[PDB]
Amino acid sequence: FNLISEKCDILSILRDHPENRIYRRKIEELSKRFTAIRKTKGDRNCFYRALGYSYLESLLGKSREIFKFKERVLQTPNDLLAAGFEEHKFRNFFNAFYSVVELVEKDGSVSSLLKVFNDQSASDHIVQFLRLLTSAFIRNRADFFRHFIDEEMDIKDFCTHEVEPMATECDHIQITALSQALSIALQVEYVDEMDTALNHHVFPEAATPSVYLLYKTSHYNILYA
Ligand SMILES: *CC(=O)NCc1ccc(Cl)s1
Numbered sequence: 001f002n003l004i005s006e007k008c009d010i011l012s013i014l015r016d017h018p019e020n021r022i023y024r025r026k027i028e029e030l031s032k033r034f035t036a037i038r039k040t041k042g043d044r045n046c047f048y049r050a051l052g053y054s055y056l057e058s059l060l061g062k063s064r065e066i067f068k069f070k071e072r073v074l075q076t077p078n079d080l081l082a083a084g085f086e087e088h089k090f091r092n093f094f095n096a097f098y099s100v101v102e103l104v105e106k107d108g109s110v111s112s113l114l115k116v117f118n119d120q121s122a123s124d125h126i127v128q129f130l131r132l133l134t135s136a137f138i139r140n141r142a143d144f145f146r147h148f149i150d151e152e153m154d155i156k157d158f159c160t161h162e163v164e165p166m167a168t169e170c171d172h173i174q175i176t177a178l179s180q181a182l183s184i185a186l187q188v189e190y191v192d193e194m195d196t197a198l199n200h201h202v203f204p205e206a207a208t209p210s211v212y213l214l215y216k217t218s219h220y221n222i223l224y225a
Helices: 010-016 021-030 046-059 063-084 087-106 110-118 120-140 142-148 156-161 172-180
Strands: 034-037 188-193 199-203 211-216 219-224
Touching: 010 021, 010 034, 010 172, 021 188, 046 063, 046 087, 046 110, 046 120, 046 172, 046 211, 063 087, 063 120, 063 172, 087 110, 087 120, 087 199, 110 120, 120 142, 120 156, 120 172, 142 156, 172 188
Parallel strands: 188 211
Antiparallel strands: 034 219, 188 199, 211 219
């Protein structure tokens, strides 16, 4: 369990910020709304790894939602081709993502899914797939991202440098794009060391979340309500 941990009680993360007034206050408040947490390795891939695991976990045993998700995943090679990715270069990553979706369907256990996400090779193939899909989705909708995010940004250069490469960290744009690309509704909780309210953002704005993540000291950890 070196990439995604076993489930722990929410208050177990007090030991990560010992004798810290503001972190202690915010973690106590968080414990009033959430029961449990999984920690992820801080290797620069933890947003993609956390969202991929938490969303597939939320599908286990749900036969309609699995069918619909599989239907969407089968179309994603068209998104990649439209953005100029070549099939022989994305094949290995697509195949690994499709395989873990079939595992959710066929096997249906938390244990089996957690083993795939802690297998360095399978887990990193999954993350690289999610990164290419994020890049395709932004590139195919460049005017949308320029209109609503930043009219001055260079979309192609941003995708080449800050989305595609392993270990590149995320901002709002990558989170919005991957949420939209896979139709995942997610809520991010923010815990920083400023004397401010514990607060959250939902992607997209009006939705009921499938997935809750905690963003703290640059990691995304997985929360359970
Ligand atoms: C999400 C993720 O992998 N974060 C990487 C980190 C950078 C600084 C940290 Cl401390 S963790």
